[PDB]
């Protein structure tokens, strides 16, 4: 039989956690200020052993089996500031001992999460806490909040109620917490919010509920201080009227049923608005059309996500509409046309349009965006123009004039012919033309990209020959030519900066040191699996296999 | 109808709903502790009982029903001595004390089905089940048509109401008789009782200790 | 849940709501000769998703039998018991007697 594992003692810090203790130790020093009894088999907290440590300020009794609480247990700890009873059997504590938890004059943070607490039993257990600042009742079985639920804790400013079964909240339920600033109601069974009267509240989490309708009180005596509202994964059918929240900065409406573009049909209930908004997530909804009045109100908005919606047209044609919009995500919609007016989205750096149905567009749609950098048109069957000469036949989208664009993706665009002046004056650093079977690169199609290009990808194009002079791309670092029929590459006479070279699944037989003389110093990884290599016929590939190459 | 739904989010909610669904049907505030579990494989009697339920053949229906089975008294235990087996009826008697042990109160019973292992039927036949109502008389029950099969098959007859009467006001030994159908124009392993009932440990009418 | 109660309280829970449909008064139709009306009724009430915990108070478990009995990802208050409605109406000059399936709702369940 092994002797007991002792507690790890530090200066006024005693750690008895995960020692399999059945009872609170009584041989601990009286001057202890921090005690950690988590992860043991404590089934009750009596006042007799614990009361000897009057200097305690931080007491953690979490993740035990505590079901009994002696009425005077914690009152002896006159200096106690943090108490953690999380993950215990405290639901039956009131049935075993009367009075519940006692007064806690100095406790600032209390954790009662994961105790299977019930409505009524919670009100019996909770005691007066004048100094309480953080309270956690998460992972319990609370079905409702009454006007007499959170009493005698006026200093409370953070309340965590996530992972409960809350369904009903009485009108004056939070009247006793005027200083409340953070309220978390995530993972609950709320279905409809008729009122919002928390003036001093700043952060509100209503995610993962069934809230079909959300409505705030209108024209308050003072402006509501809410700046962070979360309504994701609900059943919202409408965009909330947030004109009663002037200071709101964050709003996540992702994963709802919102249509643009108040009634609660499942329940049967019916009863510059966002000039300060910064981040708005409307992704995963059922928005089919965007009203003209909707975008105009969203000034100073920096991020707008509309991915995974039923949108078919997006036109920001109003003068100066969405000026500060740094990012616009319209990916995976049914977008057939989009009208980005000139001098409209002036501060737009990222435009995500992959997974749409764009075909014909005005030639200078993306050219009017002043500070456009990232542009993703994957799976959009777009046809670039020839730039200065050989004007594109029909609605060719011009990529030649965007001097600020850096990264462009034309993957899965069924591009048949890449015309010569496609990017003559677009200093791209990355360009992805992969997944375009039958692509015909015209002579000099990568016109002005010799100086700027660093990443190039042509995977899956089935190319039998590469029409671009790769050695003159002095800044190119990563080149992807995988899944093609290429057999020969232009000779590298002078040293270049190419580091990664992917030639997997091609028709390469010989890679001679004549055509690979350059980039011997800069090459680091050379992918070549899937080629009909002539064994010992080339030579340079074997000598490079040692230093400065990969498999 | 316009496309916007990803099954990945739905699956996670369906899984989490199953977590509470099983716990609520079993009336478990928390998963039971595995401390007192005896080491080794499950007993053959328990595994055989679990195989009997999986075999193919009111508010309270949400909650789980405890499963027990009681085999009929052996054929050589006064069944063949006092009760003659004709060309039609086969007599299957059950110990009422053994039934009352598996189901302490008649109200707890939710379903009881007699199960038979048919030997082999190459030709269709119509059969009828009967209950020993009086000391000599037989009460008519359900009838079923047996499809031809070259292999043995298990048959099940719902006898929930009869077993409930046996639990309350039953004799020392009752049983059923299974005879072939006789139209007025015509003058001519072992079976067990599968029981489904509410456990006393989870009975609503008893206050928790 | 008692039907006599369901149709006698304004409570936001799943239940059968009383609704009688008069062809003349409610729909303005006179082409349905028989009957003059019927108790169609309807289901109404939230079936809130319950986020399940491994540990849970014993009495809270009853919520799953009512709010989400099937453990669906998005439970709905849908009818359970349904009854046909036979009618008599004229099509041109020939009278026709036809029975419409699943017209009267007698009980509602979360699904």
């Amino acid at each position, epitope marked *: 039989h092994q002797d007991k594992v002792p507690c790890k003692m530090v200066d006024k810090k005693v750690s008895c956690q995960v020692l399999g203790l059945l009872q609170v130790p009584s041989v601990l020093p009286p001057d202890t200020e921090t005690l950690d009894l988590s992860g043991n088999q404590l089934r009750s907290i009596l006042a007799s052993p614990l009361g000897f440590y009057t200097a305690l300020r931080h007491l953690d009794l979490s993740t035990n089996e505590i079901s009994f609480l002696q*009425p005077g247990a914690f009152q002896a700890l006159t200096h106690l500031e943090h108490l953690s009873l999380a993950h215990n059997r405290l639901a039956m504590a*009131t*049935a075993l001992s*009367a*009075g*519940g938890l006692g007064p806690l004059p100095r406790v600032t943070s209390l954790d009662l999460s994961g105790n299977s607490l*019930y*409505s*009524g*039993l919670l*009100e*019996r257990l909770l005691g007066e806490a004048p100094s309480l600042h953080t309270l956690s009742l998460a992972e319990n079985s609370l*079905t*409702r909040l*009454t006007r007499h639920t959170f009493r005698d804790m006026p200093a409370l400013e953070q309340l965590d109620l996530h992972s409960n079964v809350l369904m009903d909240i009485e009108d004056g339920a939070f009247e006793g917490l005027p200083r409340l600033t953070h309220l978390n109601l995530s993972r609950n069974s709320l279905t409809c919010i008729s009122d919002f009267s928390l003036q001093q509240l700043r952060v509100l989490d209503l995610s993962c509920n069934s809230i079909e309708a959300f409505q705030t009180a209108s024209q308050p005596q003072a402006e509501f201080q809410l700046t962070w509202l979360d309504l994701r994964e609900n059943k919202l059918l409408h965009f909330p009227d947030l004109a009663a929240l002037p200071r709101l900065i964050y709003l996540n409406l992702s994963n709802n049923l919102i249509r643009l573009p108040i009634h609660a049909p499942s329940e049967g209930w019916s009863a510059r608005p966002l000039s300060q908004l910064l981040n708005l997530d409307l992704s995963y909804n059922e928005i089919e059309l965007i009203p003209d009045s909707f975008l105009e109100h969203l000034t100073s908005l920096c991020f707008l996500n509309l991915s995974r919606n039923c949108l078919r047209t997006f036109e920001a044609r109003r003068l100066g509409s969405l000026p500060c919009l740094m990012l616009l995500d319209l990916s995976h919609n049914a977008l057939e046309t989009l009208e980005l007016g000139a001098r409209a989205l002036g501060s737009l750096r990222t435009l995500l349009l992959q997974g749409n149905a764009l075909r014909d567009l005005p030639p200078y749609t993306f050219a009017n965006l002043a500070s456009l950098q990232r542009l993703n048109l994957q799976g959009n069957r777009v046809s670039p123009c020839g730039g200065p000469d050989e004007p594109g036949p029909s609605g060719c989208v011009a990529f030649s004039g965007i001097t600020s664009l850096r990264s462009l993706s034309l993957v899965d665009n069924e591009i048949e012919l890449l015309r010569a002046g496609a990017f003559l004056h677009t200093p791209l650093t990355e360009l992805d033309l992969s997944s375009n079977p039958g692509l015909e690169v015209a002579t000099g199609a990568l016109g002005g990209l010799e100086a700027s290009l660093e990443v190039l990808a042509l995977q899956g194009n089935g190319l039998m020959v590469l029409q671009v002079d790769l050695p003159c791309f002095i800044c190119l670092k990563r080149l992807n030519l995988a899944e093609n029929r290429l057999s020969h590459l232009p000779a590298w006479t002078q040293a270049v900066s190419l580091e990664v070279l992917d030639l997997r699944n091609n028709s390469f037989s010989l890679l001679p040191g004549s055509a690979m003389g350059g980039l011997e110093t800069s090459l680091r990884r050379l992918y070549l699996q899937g080629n009909p290599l002539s064994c010992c016929g080339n030579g340079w590939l074997a000598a490079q296999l040692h230093q400065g190459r990969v498999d | 109808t316009c496309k916007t739904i990803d099954m990945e989010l739905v699956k996670r909610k369906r899984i989490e709903a199953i977590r509470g669904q099983i716990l609520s049907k079993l009336r478990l505030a928390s998963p039971p502790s595995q401390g007192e579990v005896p080491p080794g494989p499950l007993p053959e009697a328990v595994l055989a009982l679990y195989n009997s339920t999986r075999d193919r053949v009111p*508010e309270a229906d949400y909650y789980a029903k405890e499963v027990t089975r009681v085999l009929m008294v052996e054929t050589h235990n006064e069944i063949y001595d006092k009760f003659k087996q004709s060309t039609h009826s086969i007599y299957m008697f059950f110990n009422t004390s053994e039934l009352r042990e598996a189901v302490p109160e008649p109200v707890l019973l939710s379903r009881a089905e007699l199960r038979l292992l048919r030997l082999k039927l190459k030709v269709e036949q119509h059969v009828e089940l009967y209950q020993k109502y009086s000391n000599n008389s037989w009460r008519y029950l359900s009838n079923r048509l047996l499809a031809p099969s070259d292999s043995p098959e298990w048959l099940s007859f719902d006898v929930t109401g009869v077993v409930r009467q046996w639990l309350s006001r039953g004799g020392e030994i009752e049983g059923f008789r299974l005879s072939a159908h006789c139209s007025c124009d015509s003058r001519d392993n072992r079976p067990f009782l599968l029981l489904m009932a509410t456990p006393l440990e989870r009975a*609503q*009418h*008893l*206050q*928790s200790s | *849940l*008692d*039907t*006599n*109660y369901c149709f*006698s*309280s304004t*409570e936001k829970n799943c239940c059968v709501r009383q609704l009688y449909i008069d062809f003349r008064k409610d729909l303005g139709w006179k082409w349905i000769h028989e009957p003059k009306g019927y108790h169609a009724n309807f289901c109404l009430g939230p079936c809130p998703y319950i986020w399940s915990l491994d540990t849970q108070y*014993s*009495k*809270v*478990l*009853a919520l799953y039998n*009512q709010h989400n009995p099937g453990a669906s990802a998005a439970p709905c208050c849908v009818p359970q018991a349904l009854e046909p409605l036979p009618i008599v109406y004229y099509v041109g000059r020939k009278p026709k007697v036809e029975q419409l399936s699943n017209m009267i709702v007698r009980s509602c369940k979360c699904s």
Partner: antibody
Amino acid sequence: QVQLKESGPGLVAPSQSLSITCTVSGFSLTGYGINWVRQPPGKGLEWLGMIWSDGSTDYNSVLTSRLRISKDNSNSQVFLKMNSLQVDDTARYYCARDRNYYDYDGAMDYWGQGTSVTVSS
Amino acid sequence: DIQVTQSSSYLSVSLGDRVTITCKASDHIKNWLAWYQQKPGIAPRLLVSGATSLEAGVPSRFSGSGSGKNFTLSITSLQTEDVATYYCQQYWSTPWTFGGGTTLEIRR
């Protein structure tokens, strides 16, 4: 409005069981608890037990085999059973609805008119 | 169990005078206590739920007070309709327990 009405046999023979049914209206039994309180002809209320909205039951400390409360939510009925009544069991038996302010409350707000139970044979 | 007791089974008082009914609990139930009124022939009616909160429809003349173990139901000015027996019932923990009652009587 809200109503509770008891249904008793009136007379009970000694050593015989007592059965009382508490019919309710205006509220669902799935969301409200029903207490059973009896009052003898002499002064004093005596709580017998209650059936919680989920069907769980708590009883008075002297209950052994003499108390059993069930209900039928679909029919808005609560059933009380009492075995082997004696002379001292002659009393008026009420059923009171629980004030469901909390899920675990206990305060009784709506009482039935009560039923007289006499054990005399 | 939590026993609850009413020391005075009878309390003499005249009309228009102040009346106070005491009811003590065996342990600190902290507010979880109710007050009931029962006419000699009528069924009991809830007067005070919690230690202080008056039920809807109760006259303002009645009032409750107390916390922990000691409690009291006060009547500001006694009326003829208040001549009845009063009970207290704790609900801190099951089983719910009643008091012995306090029947009011007119002094003479």
